[PDB]
Amino acid sequence: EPSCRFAHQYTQEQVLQNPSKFINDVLFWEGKFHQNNISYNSGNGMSYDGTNIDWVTGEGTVKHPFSAASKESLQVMLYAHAIAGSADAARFLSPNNPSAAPGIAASIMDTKLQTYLRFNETYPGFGGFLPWFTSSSQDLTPTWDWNNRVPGLDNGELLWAVYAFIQAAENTSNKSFIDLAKKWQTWMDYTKTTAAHIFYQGEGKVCAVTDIKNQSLPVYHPEQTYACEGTSYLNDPYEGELFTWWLQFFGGLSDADIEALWEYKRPQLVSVDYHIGNVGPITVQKGYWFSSHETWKVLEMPYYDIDIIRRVFQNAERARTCNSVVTQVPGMFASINNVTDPATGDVVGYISNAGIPSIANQTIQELDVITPYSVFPTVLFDKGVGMAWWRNMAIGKKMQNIYGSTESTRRDGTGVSALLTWDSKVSTVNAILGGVSGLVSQKMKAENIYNTFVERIEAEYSRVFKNLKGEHVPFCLPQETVPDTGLVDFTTCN
Ligand X SMILES: *[C@@H]1O[C@H](CO)[C@@H](O)[C@H](O)[C@H]1NC(C)=O
Which stretches within 251-306 are classed as H helix? 255-265
134 contacts 141 by C-beta, under 8 angstroms: yes
> Coil, strand or helix: which one is 276?
strand
Q: Which residues contact 363 (CB under 8 A, 6 or more apart)?
A: 357
User: What distance in Å separates the CA atoms of residue 164 and residue 433, rounded to the nearest whole number?
Assistant: 13
Radius of gyration over alpha carbons of the chain, in Å? 22
User: What distance in Å separates the CA atoms of residue 402 and residue 395, rounded to the nearest whole number?
Assistant: 14
User: What distance in Å separates the CA atoms of residue 481 and residue 420, rounded to the nearest whole number?
Assistant: 22
Residues 450-469 that bind ligand X (CB under 6 A): none
CB of 170 to ligand X, least distance (A): 18
Q: Which residue's CB is nearer to ligand X, number 339 or number 477?
A: 339
Q: Is 342 in the site for ligand X (CB under 6 A)?
A: no
Q: Which residue's CB is nearer to ligand X, number 37 or number 122?
A: 122
User: What distance in Å separates the CA atoms of residue 71 and residue 115, rounded to the nearest whole number?
Assistant: 16
Q: Is 180 in the site for ligand X (CB under 6 A)?
A: no
Distances from the Cα of 129 to the Cα of 28, 60, 212, 310, angstroms: 33, 30, 12, 31
Binder to ligand X among 11, 186, 232, 479 (CB under 6 A)? 186
Which strand ranges, in their side-by-side order, compose the sheet holding 133-134?
66-67, 133-134, 141-142
Other beta carbons within 10 angstroms of residue 221's beta carbon come to 13
Residue at shortest CB range from ligand X = 349
Q: Is 355 in the site for ligand X (CB under 6 A)?
A: no
User: What distance in Å separates the CA atoms of residue 386 and residue 373, rounded to the nearest whole number?
Assistant: 10
CB of 367 to ligand X, least distance (A): 11
CB of 351 to ligand X, least distance (A): 5
- In angstroms, how far is CA 112 from the centroid of its own chain? 19
Q: Which residue's CB is nearer to ligand X, number 49 or number 88?
A: 49
Q: After which residues is the chain broken (C to N over 2.5 A)?
A: none
Q: Is 348 in the site for ligand X (CB under 6 A)?
A: yes
Q: E strand or H helix at 437, and its extent?
A: helix 437-446
CB of 366 to ligand X, least distance (A): 6
Binder to ligand X among 60, 102, 124, 151 (CB under 6 A)? 124
CB of 442 to ligand X, least distance (A): 23
Q: H/E/C letters for each residue in 34-93?
A: CCECCCEECCCCEECCEEEECCCCCCEEEEECEECHHHHHHHHHHHHHHHHCCHHHHHHH
Q: Is 109 in the site for ligand X (CB under 6 A)?
A: no
Q: Which residue's CB is nearer to ligand X, number 43 or number 349?
A: 349
Q: Is 128 in the site for ligand X (CB under 6 A)?
A: yes
CB of 120 to ligand X, least distance (A): 4
Other beta carbons within 10 angstroms of residue 416's beta carbon come to 23
Window of 167-175, 211-219, 372-380, 475-483 that interacts with ligand X by CB under 6 A: 211-219
Q: Which residue's CB is nearer to ligand X, number 37 or number 216?
A: 216
Is the backbone of residue 135 left (phi > 0), alpha (psi -120 to 50) or beta? alpha
Relative to beta strand 419-421, strand 50-53 is: antiparallel
Q: Is 339 in the site for ligand X (CB under 6 A)?
A: yes
Q: Which residue's CB is nearer to ligand X, number 12 or number 365?
A: 365
Q: Which residue's CB is nearer to ligand X, number 217 or number 473?
A: 217
CB of 403 to ligand X, least distance (A): 23
Q: Which residue's CB is nearer to ligand X, number 309 or number 336?
A: 336
Q: Is 349 in the site for ligand X (CB under 6 A)?
A: yes
Q: Is 291 in the site for ligand X (CB under 6 A)?
A: no
User: What distance in Å separates the CA atoms of residue 208 and residue 459, rounded to the nearest whole number?
Assistant: 24
Point out which residues pair with 141 in neighbouring strands. 134
Window of 173-181, 215-223, 288-296, 476-484 that interacts with ligand X by CB under 6 A: 215-223
Q: Is 218 in the site for ligand X (CB under 6 A)?
A: yes
x/- track of binding to ligand X for residues 65-104 (CB under 6 A): ----------------------------------------
CB of 1 to ligand X, least distance (A): 37
User: What distance in Å separates the CA atoms of residue 192 and residue 126, rounded to the nearest whole number?
Assistant: 13
Binder to ligand X among 51, 120, 321, 428 (CB under 6 A)? 120
CB of 451 to ligand X, least distance (A): 29
CB of 119 to ligand X, least distance (A): 9
102 contacts 80 by C-beta, under 8 angstroms: no
CB of 4 to ligand X, least distance (A): 26
CB of 158 to ligand X, least distance (A): 14
Q: Which residue's CB is nearer to ligand X, number 293 or number 297?
A: 293
Q: Is 264 in the site for ligand X (CB under 6 A)?
A: no
User: What distance in Å separates the CA atoms of residue 168 and residue 393, rounded to the nearest whole number?
Assistant: 33
CB of 320 to ligand X, least distance (A): 21
Binder to ligand X among 58, 240, 302, 415 (CB under 6 A)? 415
- Applying CB under 6 A, the residues found at the interface with ligand X are 117, 120, 124, 128, 186-187, 190, 214, 216-218, 338-339, 348-349, 351, 366, 415
